[PDB]
Amino acid sequence: WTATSGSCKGRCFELQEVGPPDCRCDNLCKSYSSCCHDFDELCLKTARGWECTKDRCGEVRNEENACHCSEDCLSRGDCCTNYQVVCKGESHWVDDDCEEIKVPECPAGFVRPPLIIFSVDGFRASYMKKGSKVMPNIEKLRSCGTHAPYMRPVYPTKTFPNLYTLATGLYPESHGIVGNSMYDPVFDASFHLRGREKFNHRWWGGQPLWITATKQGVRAGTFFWSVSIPHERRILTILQWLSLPDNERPSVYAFYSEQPDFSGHKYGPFGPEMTNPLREIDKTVGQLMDGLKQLRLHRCVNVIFVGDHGMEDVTCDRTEFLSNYLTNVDDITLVPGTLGRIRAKSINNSKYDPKTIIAALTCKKPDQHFKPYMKQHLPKRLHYANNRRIEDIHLLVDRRWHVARKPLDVYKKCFFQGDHGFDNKVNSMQTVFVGYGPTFKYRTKVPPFENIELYNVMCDLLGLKPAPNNGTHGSLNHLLRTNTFRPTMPDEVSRPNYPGIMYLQSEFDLGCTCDDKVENKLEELNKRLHTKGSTKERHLLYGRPAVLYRTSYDILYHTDFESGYSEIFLMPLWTSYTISKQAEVSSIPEHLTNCVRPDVRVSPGFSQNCLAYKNDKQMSYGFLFPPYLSSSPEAKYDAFLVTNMVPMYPAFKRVWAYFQRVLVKKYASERNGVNVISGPIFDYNYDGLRDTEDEIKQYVEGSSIPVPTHYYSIITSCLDFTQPADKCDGPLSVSSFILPHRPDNDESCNSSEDESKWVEELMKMHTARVRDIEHLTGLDFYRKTSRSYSEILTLKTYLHTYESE
Numbered sequence: 001w002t003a004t005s006g007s008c009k010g011r012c013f014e015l016q017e018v019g020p021p022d023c024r025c026d027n028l029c030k031s032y033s034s035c036c037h038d039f040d041e042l043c044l045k046t047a048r049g050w051e052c053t054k055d056r057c058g059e060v061r062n063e064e065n066a067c068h069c070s071e072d073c074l075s076r077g078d079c080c081t082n083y084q085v086v087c088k089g090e091s092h093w094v095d096d097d098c099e100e101i102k103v104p105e106c107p108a109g110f111v112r113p114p115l116i117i118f119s120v121d122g123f124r125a126s127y128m129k130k131g132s133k134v135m136p137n138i139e140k141l142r143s144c145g146t147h148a149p150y151m152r153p154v155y156p157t158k159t160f161p162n163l164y165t166l167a168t169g170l171y172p173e174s175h176g177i178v179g180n181s182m183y184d185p186v187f188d189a190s191f192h193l194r195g196r197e198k199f200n201h202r203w204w205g206g207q208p209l210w211i212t213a214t215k216q217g218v219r220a221g222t223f224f225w226s227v228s229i230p231h232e233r234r235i236l237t238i239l240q241w242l243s244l245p246d247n248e249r250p251s252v253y254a255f256y257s258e259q260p261d262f263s264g265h266k267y268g269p270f271g272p273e274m275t276n277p278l279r280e281i282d283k284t285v286g287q288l289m290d291g292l293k294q295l296r297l298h299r300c301v302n303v304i305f306v307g308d309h310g311m312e313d314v315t316c317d318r319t320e321f322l323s324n325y326l327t328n329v330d331d332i333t334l335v336p337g338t339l340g341r342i343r344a345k346s347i348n349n350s351k352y353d354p355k356t357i358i359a360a361l362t363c364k365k366p367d368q369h370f371k372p373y374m375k376q377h378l379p380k381r382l383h384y385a386n387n388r389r390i391e392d393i394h395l396l397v398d399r400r401w402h403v404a405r406k407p408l409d410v411y412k413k414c415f416f417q418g419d420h421g422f423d424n425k426v427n428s429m430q431t432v433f434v435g436y437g438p439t440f441k442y443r444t445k446v447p448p449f450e451n452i453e454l455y456n457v458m459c460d461l462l463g464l465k466p467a468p469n470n471g472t473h474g475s476l477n478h479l480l481r482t483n484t485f486r487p488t489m490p491d492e493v494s495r496p497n498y499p500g501i502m503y504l505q506s507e508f509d510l511g512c513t514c515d516d517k518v519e520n521k522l523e524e525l526n527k528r529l530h531t532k533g534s535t536k537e538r539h540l541l542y543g544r545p546a547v548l549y550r551t552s553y554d555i556l557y558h559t560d561f562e563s564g565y566s567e568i569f570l571m572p573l574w575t576s577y578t579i580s581k582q583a584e585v586s587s588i589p590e591h592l593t594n595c596v597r598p599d600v601r602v603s604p605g606f607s608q609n610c611l612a613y614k615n616d617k618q619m620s621y622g623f624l625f626p627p628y629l630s631s632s633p634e635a636k637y638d639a640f641l642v643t644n645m646v647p648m649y650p651a652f653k654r655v656w657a658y659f660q661r662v663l664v665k666k667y668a669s670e671r672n673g674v675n676v677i678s679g680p681i682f683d684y685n686y687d688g689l690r691d692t693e694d695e696i697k698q699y700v701e702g703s704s705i706p707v708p709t710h711y712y713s714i715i716t717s718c719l720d721f722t723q724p725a726d727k728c729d730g731p732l733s734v735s736s737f738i739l740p741h742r743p744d745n746d747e748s749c750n751s752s753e754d755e756s757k758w759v760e761e762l763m764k765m766h767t768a769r770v771r772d773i774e775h776l777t778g779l780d781f782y783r784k785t786s787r788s789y790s791e792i793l794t795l796k797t798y799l800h801t802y803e804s805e
């Protein structure tokens with residue numbers, strides 16, 4: 001109950017919300033049916049429209065008008081945004097040449113440049129080029145400021161997950177807004193777009209920018225606008241707030257546009273009906289910039305123009321129905337559309353089985369347009385698993401398609417021609433970023449980057465210390481003229497041992513055998529120097545990775561590769577090797593097919609054993625440095641060391657062998673040499689973070705050898721591919737992957753065919769950032785390069801997406 005009989009007089013768009021049942025006059029009151037009786041009359045004035053005309057100039061202040069063209073309007077802060085243009089011979093902001101903003105040029109009393117966040121729903125990245133003729137204000141922001149060709153949203157590429165990621169710097173799994181629709185089993189409660197539950201604070205985790213600012217004594221504009229308040233009124237309200245006295249005036253403001261998303265759903269992303277919504281958004285930008293210019297704030301404010309996600313062509317006829325696959329369709333609940341989430345209809349049904357649901361959904365039709373996953377098997381780059389609100393069973397839906405439970409759900413719910421929500425790598429889901437203002441660079445293009453990074457930069461823009469988040473602070477310093485954040489490399493926690501020869505062959509009883517008892521002063525000083533690290537500068541190009549947690553591990557040198565070997569996990573944490581463009585691929589000699597050799601630098605007690613693999617009928621083994629790329633028949637023996645061995649399911653060995661035999665040489669040829677770092681990952685609790693020993697759920701049978709959940713590789717070369725990887729003088733180029741270590745290849749529907757038809761497609765799907773691998777392993781890479789640390793942070797956040805242009 002609200003006693004809606006108080007008044008909004010003098011209170012219109014008040015900045016602190018009042019506690020029921022006193023009536024409200026803030027920009028959100030409509031959404032709560034809590035505005036005072038007189039809110040529309042006082043606060044939502046529309047008389048005479050939104051623009052000064054010739055004959056309104058100098059007029060007598062009529063307070064009924066939506067905006068004013070009288071003489072006192074400038075000092076009142078409530079002129080129509082085109083006042084000075086109509087009545088003072090001034091030019092529109094878009095018609096002025098842009099001039100570099102070297103320093104903030106602000107009115108007296110401003111302690112920092114204000115930040116205005118202008119967010120647009122469904123603004124697909126290619127609108128910047130394709131709609132440029134009809135968006136002159138936006139094009140001026142873009143070309144005069146700092147811009148990215150596109151900005152990558154988070155998954156799912158839905159509105160609320162992405163806006164809240166923008167606000168928090170957190171993945172949806174961490175902030176808790178994991179879709180536009182959700183069930184939380186602990187609350188036993190549901191979140192929906194329509195309705196009241198979404199207002200309850202328990203849905204909304206992390207610390208959004210407005211709370212960060214408030215806690216640190218930076219005043220924030222109430223960010224959110226009830227939908228019926230028109231755009232013109234939102235802009236005028238922001239401009240009025242910017243006229244408050246210094247002690248009351250916010251330093252950060254937000255504008256949100258429901259367009260072009262609203263129309264994009266109805267007409268598709270490039271429907272001829274889409275020109276008008278784009279023109280209208282540009283006009284709103286024009287009104288803000290003209291308004292700032294009137295207030296002499298146009299060279300003082302930092303403006304961010306940012307989208308939440310793009311929009312793809314999707315129609316009712318491109319719907320797959322679970323009723324075409326499942327006999328038991330009534331025993332499941334589906335969250336439907338551009339992603340699928342499945343759980344049991346009733347928790348009292350003990351006959352429901354996710355195993356059989358997944359199987360009935362796997363590779364059942366030749367051109368099936370969704371793929372089912374247990375959430376912990378989704379590509380790690382999605383970071384979409386560690387939340388009780390994310391159902392165990394997930395469907396990744398092909399772009400341009402929908403999934404529904406039953407055909408009745410679609411024709412009793414063709415309306416729409418656009419939608420979004422798909423894999424955040426998809427080109428049509430990419431969105432926009434432009435930063436314009438004193439703190440951004442002038443006429444600068446920056447590479448594509450992920451929206452999780454922006455919270456840190458908005459904090460930087462406001463002099464705020466960011467709450468802990470998933471951005472990599474410093475990776476976007478290259479957007480900024482000043483206020484950069486100067487991070488330090490994390491300190492190494494564990495230093496390595498460098499073991500020499502300490503064990504005799506006969507101390508090992510690992511049940512391993514090798515055909516290698518075959519016999520020199522020249523070449524014996526040689527093998528010794530290699531084992532002391534003589535070739536190390538060739539194979540470890542960027543320093544050894546730092547171990548950022550407490551553990552016991554050894555560095556092992558070899559002719560062709562270097563590794564950091566964990567005495568706790570009984571395998572390398574990392575193995576580093578360089579493969580030049582000239583390198584040759586050889587095969588494993590026949591006599592060496594099942595060769596495993598004891599490593600006399602590492603005790604039997606800290607070694608794997610071959611008997612455990614023999615006894616484990618499910619588990620086999622592979623090598624991290626591939627024997628195929630050995631530099632000489634003699635160096636090849638190093639590759640069969642028990643300290644280079646890792647457990648591998650036979651089904652995964654198909655993947656791994658093709659990577660090592662075919663793909664590594666292919667990249668070396670294409671990139672003029674590559675450096676490769678590979679290693680195991682353990683993430684049994686699917687939280688994206690390195691597991692401790694006591695979190696490991698699976699061991700090679702009868703042993704203490706832990707089974708990795710994933711294998712990674714980081715493949716670095718010179719960005720200037722005219723220089724070989726091992727002799728590179730400038731910026732680097734990287735691609736990485738985190739392959740799930742699975743006992744079957746059910747994920748790849750064509751896996752009964754030759755690896756040349758399916759493995760590279762699997763690797764692409766599991767593309768990753770170096771930063772993702774750092775979280776998962778507790779390692780820090782690129783410790784010693786000649787590049788600036790900010791530049792290295794950017795490289796560590798790079799994702800190679802394999803989408804076309």
Ligand SMILES: *[C@@H]1O[C@H](CO)[C@@H](O[C@@H]2O[C@H](CO)[C@@H](O[C@@H]3O[C@H](CO[C@H]4O[C@H](CO)[C@@H](O)[C@H](O[C@H]5O[C@H](CO)[C@@H](O)[C@H](O)[C@@H]5O[C@H]5O[C@H](CO)[C@@H](O)[C@H](O)[C@@H]5O)[C@@H]4O)[C@@H](O)[C@H](O[C@H]4O[C@H](CO)[C@@H](O)[C@H](O)[C@@H]4O[C@H]4O[C@H](CO)[C@@H](O)[C@H](O)[C@@H]4O)[C@@H]3O)[C@H](O)[C@H]2NC(C)=O)[C@H](O)[C@H]1NC(C)=O
Nearest residue numbers: 173174175176204205206386387388468469470687688775
């Ligand atoms: C992306 O960035 C984020 C932010 O940095 C990273 O997430 C952080 O990771 C930390 C490590 O996992 C984690 O630290 C834990 O904090 C626990 C206290 O948590 C509360 O307080 C914080 C701070 O205000 C708050 O943010 C949290 O909010 C979460 O929970 C509510 C709902 O419950 C949500 O509204 C909110 O969205 C958020 O949920 C997310 O995080 C939780 C995990 O905390 C997930 O479960 C959710 O699914 C969701 O993803 C909390 O309100 C603290 O209690 C933990 O301490 C335990 O472990 C330590 C090790 O130091 C041990 O010493 C302690 O004994 C303790 O163990 C005890 O509790 C155990 C569990 O019950 C029990 O098993 C033991 O036996 C002990 O009794 C821990 O330190 C931090 O909370 C989150 N922060 C956020 C915002 O999510 C994230 O990792 C990054 N992702 C990647 C890929 O890098």
Ligand SMILES: Cn1c(-c2cnc(OC3CCOCC3)c(C3CC3)c2)n[nH]c1=O
Nearest residue numbers: 117160163164166167223224225254256
């Ligand atoms: C969807 N929505 C909104 C709305 C607008 N902006 C938002 O976040 C932005 C605030 C500024 O920083 C950039 C993020 C949010 C987040 C989701 C809570 C919601 N308002 N009205 C409406 O329908």
Ligand SMILES: [Ca+2]
Nearest residue numbers: 683689690691
């Ligand atoms: Ca983990």
Ligand SMILES: [Cl-]
Nearest residue numbers: 158179180181
């Ligand atoms: Cl959703």
Ligand code: NA
Nearest residue numbers: 613616617619
């Ligand atoms: Na075996």
Ligand code: NA
Nearest residue numbers: 745746748751
């Ligand atoms: Na298969």
Ligand SMILES: [Zn+2]
Nearest residue numbers: 122159261265
């Ligand atoms: Zn939408």
